Design an enzyme around this catalytic site. Structure first.
Site, short mmCIF file in Angstrom:
data_model
loop_
_atom_site.label_atom_id
_atom_site.label_comp_id
_atom_site.label_asym_id
_atom_site.label_seq_id
_atom_site.Cartn_x
_atom_site.Cartn_y
_atom_site.Cartn_z
N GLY A 241 52.43 53.57 94.05
CA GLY A 241 51.59 54.62 95.00
C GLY A 241 50.86 55.44 94.40
O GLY A 241 50.65 55.39 93.05
N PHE B 176 51.58 58.44 93.58
CA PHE B 176 52.84 58.94 92.91
C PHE B 176 53.89 58.02 93.00
O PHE B 176 54.08 57.18 94.18
CB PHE B 176 53.30 60.33 92.86
CG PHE B 176 54.19 60.20 94.30
CD1 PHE B 176 55.34 60.21 94.36
CD2 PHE B 176 53.51 60.58 95.51
CE1 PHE B 176 56.38 60.15 95.61
CE2 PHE B 176 54.45 60.66 96.68
CZ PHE B 176 55.50 60.44 96.73
N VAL C 214 57.34 51.25 92.70
CA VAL C 214 58.82 50.66 93.40
C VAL C 214 58.99 49.46 92.74
O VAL C 214 58.33 48.56 92.63
CB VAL C 214 58.47 50.64 94.97
CG1 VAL C 214 59.63 49.88 95.48
CG2 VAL C 214 58.16 51.81 95.63
N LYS D 60 62.40 53.35 94.07
CA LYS D 60 61.35 54.14 93.65
C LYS D 60 61.59 55.04 92.33
O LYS D 60 62.58 55.75 92.44
CB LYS D 60 60.67 55.01 94.89
CG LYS D 60 59.18 55.56 94.53
CD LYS D 60 58.92 56.23 95.94
CE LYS D 60 57.40 56.32 95.61
NZ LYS D 60 56.89 57.43 96.76
N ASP E 123 49.53 58.73 107.75
CA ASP E 123 48.62 57.74 107.32
C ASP E 123 49.72 56.26 107.77
O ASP E 123 49.97 55.41 107.20
CB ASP E 123 48.57 57.35 105.83
CG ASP E 123 47.49 56.43 105.46
OD1 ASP E 123 46.95 56.00 106.28
OD2 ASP E 123 47.79 55.84 104.25
N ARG F 66 49.91 48.31 106.85
CA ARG F 66 50.43 48.35 105.16
C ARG F 66 51.61 48.99 105.10
O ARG F 66 52.22 48.84 103.87
CB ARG F 66 49.08 48.57 104.53
CG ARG F 66 49.17 49.89 103.87
CD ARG F 66 49.14 49.40 102.42
NE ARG F 66 49.33 50.65 101.47
CZ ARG F 66 50.49 50.30 100.82
NH1 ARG F 66 50.42 49.76 99.53
NH2 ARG F 66 51.46 51.17 101.16
N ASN F 67 51.84 50.11 105.81
CA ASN F 67 52.90 51.13 105.69
C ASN F 67 54.03 50.72 106.56
O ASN F 67 54.89 51.57 106.84
CB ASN F 67 52.62 52.30 105.81
CG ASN F 67 51.68 53.23 104.64
OD1 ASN F 67 52.21 52.70 103.50
ND2 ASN F 67 50.62 53.84 104.68
N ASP G 15 57.22 55.15 103.62
CA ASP G 15 56.17 56.22 103.35
C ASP G 15 55.87 57.44 104.30
O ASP G 15 55.03 57.61 104.39
CB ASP G 15 55.15 55.67 102.56
CG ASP G 15 55.55 54.90 101.34
OD1 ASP G 15 56.47 54.85 100.98
OD2 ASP G 15 54.66 53.99 100.87
C1 LIG Z 1 63.44 43.13 98.85
O1 LIG Z 1 63.96 43.12 100.22
C2 LIG Z 1 62.04 42.48 98.83
N1 LIG Z 1 61.06 43.15 98.95
C3 LIG Z 1 59.80 42.58 98.96
C4 LIG Z 1 58.83 43.19 99.12
C5 LIG Z 1 58.33 44.43 99.66
O2 LIG Z 1 56.96 44.86 99.71
N2 LIG Z 1 59.57 45.27 99.39
C6 LIG Z 1 59.22 46.71 99.62
C7 LIG Z 1 58.55 47.32 99.43
C8 LIG Z 1 58.48 48.72 99.59
O3 LIG Z 1 57.49 49.42 99.31
C9 LIG Z 1 56.33 49.19 98.64
C10 LIG Z 1 55.69 50.21 97.72
C11 LIG Z 1 55.39 48.77 99.26
C12 LIG Z 1 54.65 47.32 98.98
CL1 LIG Z 1 55.27 46.70 97.43
C13 LIG Z 1 53.81 46.91 99.79
N3 LIG Z 1 53.49 47.47 101.08
C14 LIG Z 1 53.82 48.73 101.54
C15 LIG Z 1 54.89 49.03 100.53
CL2 LIG Z 1 55.58 50.74 101.14
C16 LIG Z 1 59.57 49.11 100.16
C17 LIG Z 1 59.76 50.46 100.46
N4 LIG Z 1 59.94 51.88 100.51
C18 LIG Z 1 60.58 48.40 100.28
N5 LIG Z 1 60.76 47.29 100.01
C19 LIG Z 1 57.70 42.04 98.98
N6 LIG Z 1 58.60 41.05 98.77
C20 LIG Z 1 57.83 39.74 98.40
C21 LIG Z 1 57.49 39.08 99.46
N7 LIG Z 1 57.13 37.57 99.50
C22 LIG Z 1 55.52 37.05 99.58
C23 LIG Z 1 55.72 35.82 99.22
O4 LIG Z 1 56.13 34.84 100.21
C24 LIG Z 1 57.61 35.34 100.39
C25 LIG Z 1 57.85 36.78 100.36
C26 LIG Z 1 59.89 41.27 98.91
C27 LIG Z 1 60.93 40.68 98.32
C28 LIG Z 1 61.86 41.16 98.57
BR1 LIG Z 1 63.56 40.21 98.05
#
Ligand SMILES: *C(=O)c1nc2c(C(=O)Nc3cc(O[C@H](C)c4c(Cl)cncc4Cl)c(C#N)cn3)cn(CCN3CCOCC3)c2cc1Br
Length: 300
Positions: free
Chosen positions: A24, A26, A29, A51, A160, A164-165, A178
């Site tokens: 992000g 800041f 993750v 994070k 926001d 996406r959030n 977030d």
């Molecule tokens: C764990 O359960 C897990 N998480 C993910 C995610 C994923 O996005 N996890 C996630 C992200 C978080 O915040 C980040 C900054 C974020 C992202 Cl990366 C994207 N968009 C918004 C935000 Cl806020 C947070 C928080 N807080 C918590 N968790 C993504 N994947 C992979 C998805 N994958 C794509 C291909 O097909 C299969 C699924 C995972 C996997 C896992 Br195990």
């Protein structure tokens, strides 16, 4: 060197850091395994999102992450938000441990599940049938509204709110992420395009964009945009409209058109969220109830 909070403190050695998920303004993750997050089962493994500060972080970056941490402590627990699980503040880098959503954010969830195009050879008994159905889309919207209602009751403004959030769990539960973040509202580059092509200005309420005023009703505006995202199955709002044109159009009171395959009930809710006067927009409580009526009417 931060003060010890035994309520939330988690032994960092019980974490195994894995593949990064994203970064992000800041903080970054990272996916991780946690052992004994439930103190009743010390050797039980679970998947969590950690994070942490990025490399060569500034003091302000640390302050922002600390600020996020404290908000997470105060917000309490709800089914439709990303919940705080623990923190690592002692003898090592600052970790903010939260719930992990296995299916990524709501926008990518929808875009990867768009119906099969008519170019596809009919193979099987449900060939036209895509993964996404109308009641599930309505449920996604309902869950986000309930989550936002909870956040509002805790005096929390998202600033926001967007697809996406919103994060999706393995059981397709919507979790708002977030929500307690410093987003530098006094220095926003309205022309800034993200690496994935997003223009965050298209989610801002008029009073937020023009007057730098944020309320829960400004989030309701954002929720309306999020509604549009859901029923366009992860589409980008104000299609083909650059930021400069967005400015003048908003000043003229322009609104998005009704998207295809979207019932009038839901576009009605969208337009209500986009009413110029914040008091003329529904509350999240009203949104929850309104979406509930639709959901119950399509869950025979
Ligand atoms: C764990 O359960 C897990 N998480 C993910 C995610 C994923 O996005 N996890 C996630 C992200 C978080 O915040 C980040 C900054 C974020 C992202 Cl990366 C994207 N968009 C918004 C935000 Cl806020 C947070 C928080 N807080 C918590 N968790 C993504 N994947 C992979 C998805 N994958 C794509 C291909 O097909 C299969 C699924 C995972 C996997 C896992 Br195990």
């Amino acid at each position: 060197d931060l003060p010890l909070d035994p309520l939330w403190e988690f032994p960092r050695d019980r974490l195994v850091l894995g593949k990064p998920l994203g970064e992000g303004a800041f903080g970054q993750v990272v996916r991780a395994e946690a052992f004994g997050m439930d103190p009743a089962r010390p050797d039980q493994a679970s998947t969590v999102a950690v994070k942490m500060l990025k490399d060569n972080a500034s003091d302000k970056d640390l302050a922002d992450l600390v600020s996020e941490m404290e908000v997470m402590k105060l917000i309490g627990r709800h089914k439709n938000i990303i919940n705080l699980l623990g923190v690592c503040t002692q003898e090592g880098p600052l970790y903010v441990i939260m719930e992990c959503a296995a299916k990524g954010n709501l926008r990518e969830f929808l875009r990867a599940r768009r119906p099969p195009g008519p170019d596809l050879s009919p193979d099987g008994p449900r060939s036209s049938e895509g993964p996404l159905s109308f009641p599930v889309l309505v449920s996604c919207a309902y869950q986000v509204a309930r989550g936002m209602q909870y956040l509002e009751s805790r005096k929390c403004i998202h600033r926001d709110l967007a697809a996406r959030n919103v994060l999706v769990t393995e059981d397709n539960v919507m979790k708002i992420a977030d929500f307690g973040l410093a987003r530098g509202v006094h220095h926003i580059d309205y022309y800034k395009k993200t690496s994935n092509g997003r223009l965050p200005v298209k989610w801002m309420a008029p009073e937020a964009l023009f007057d730098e005023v944020y309320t829960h009703q400004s989030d309701v505006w954002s929720f309306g945009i999020l509604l549009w995202e859901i029923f366009t199955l992860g589409g980008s709002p104000y299609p083909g409209i650059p930021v400069e044109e967005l400015f003048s159009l908003l000043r003229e009171g322009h609104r998005m058109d009704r998207p295809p395959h979207c019932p009038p009930e839901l576009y009605g809710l969208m337009r209500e969220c986009w009413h110029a006067a914040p008091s003329q927009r529904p509350t999240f409580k009203q949104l929850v109830e309104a979406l509930d009526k639709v959901l119950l009417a399509v869950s025979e």
